[PDB]
């Protein structure tokens, strides 16, 4: 058992049929010593008598708010949450696996640039009795400072017969060095509580690995002489790091109507020449030129 926050404790339960659970001793936070009784949650059945209560925690039914009373009045609260482990695996019910990039990816973080600002996302089908808590830092031994905002609902879509809710957090490294070569990774740690079910998640990454520039800016076309060719032109996105002579980008351009495996062409220049067809569209992405991080989304125009 360990303290999560003031008067809130977590019990680690390795559950299986006929498991014994964990023996937990609670102590009423009082100078008094006699005439003390104990309850659980909102029931008025007395469970024990004395300044200390010993319980065998072996299910969620044994968790909740234990309260001690003396002389008909309340003295102290203690809320027990459970971190359920089953066959050597911590529960992960609250968050949904996004499976991008890797399996077992519950927190997904991206950065629009090297400034040190990044955003993490996660998914849940729960809408009530849900609490999150997010801290972050660079390095684990002597950690540097990373301040994060509050997690809030950002989106909400459909997942068959369930609504899927999306939370997000803005984070910023206290002292960033956009040009430097990172040696220690960012650590993001999220605690989640749903009713009496505690869980936590983690994510490690270098900014350079999670970088996803915004789509190319000001994408435009213009006809050429004779043959049905077009000149595609675009610019760097505003959110991208600056100067652009130092933080260079690569671009991918493709035609696609409606087996367009050959329509793609790559270039470091900010415009290209392509061939258009009826009702086909031209679209372009952007990627860091010198480090194969993530591609941006598409920026498209009709032919």
């Amino acid at each position: 058992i360990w303290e999560l926050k003031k008067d809130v404790y977590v019990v680690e339960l390795d559950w299986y049929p006929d498991a014994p659970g964990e023996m937990v001793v609670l102590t009423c936070d009082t100078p008094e010593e006699d005439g003390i009784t104990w309850t659980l949650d909102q029931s008025s059945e007395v469970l024990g008598s004395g300044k200390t209560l010993t319980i065998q925690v072996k299910e969620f039914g044994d968790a909740g708010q234990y309260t001690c009373h003396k002389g008909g009045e309340v003295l102290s609260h203690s809320l027990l949450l459970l971190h359920k482990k089953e066959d050597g695996i911590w529960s992960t019910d609250i968050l949904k696996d996004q499976k991008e990039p890797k399996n077992k990816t519950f927190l997904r973080c991206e950065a629009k640039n090297y400034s040190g600002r990044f955003t993490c996302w996660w998914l849940t089908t729960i809408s009530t009795d849900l609490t999150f808590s997010v801290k972050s830092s660079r390095g684990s031994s002597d950690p540097q400072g990373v301040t994060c905002g509050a997690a809030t609902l950002s989106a909400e879509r459909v997942r068959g017969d369930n609504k899927e809710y999306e939370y997000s957090v803005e984070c910023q490294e206290d002292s960033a060095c956009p040009a430097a070569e990172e040696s220690l990774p960012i650590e993001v740690m999220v605690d989640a509580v749903h009713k009496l079910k505690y869980e936590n998640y983690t994510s490690s990454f270098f900014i350079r690995d999670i970088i996803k520039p915004d789509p190319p800016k000001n994408l435009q076309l213009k006809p050429l002489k004779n043959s049905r060719q077009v000149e595609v032109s675009w610019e760097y996105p505003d959110t991208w790091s600056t100067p652009h002579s130092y933080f260079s980008l690569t671009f991918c351009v493709q035609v696609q109507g409606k087996r367009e495996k050959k329509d793609r062409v790559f270039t470091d220049k900010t415009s290209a020449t392509v061939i258009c067809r009826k009702n086909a569209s031209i679209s372009v992405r952007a990627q860091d030129r010198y480090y194969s991080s993530s591609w941006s989304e598409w920026a498209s125009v009709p032919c």
Partner: nanobody
Amino acid sequence: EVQLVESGGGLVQAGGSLRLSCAASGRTFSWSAVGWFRQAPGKEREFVAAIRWSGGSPYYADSVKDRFTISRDNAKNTVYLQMNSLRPEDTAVYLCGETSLFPTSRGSHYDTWGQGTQVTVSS
């Protein structure tokens, strides 16, 4: 809103056996679980057994493990309670409920309930 409907109850004689069923309209969460409670006359409803839709070992009450076995059928979306070797002390209303905190024996942790089916065992 999930809906739960019990059935299979009735009047059997000591040593007999019934199979109750709890037909659910769906699942609040992928990890939701369905549990059987039993409400004898005069007393409060006591936990019997519970099982997750996603499988794994169920969670039985201290005693019933030998006589009672709980099973599921994801296709029909129904949970079964096979009761064997019944005694007159088993007479009660058998209710079924859905929970998001498997394993749990506490009623207040089950968010949705059926109206229950009557089981009467006569010596």
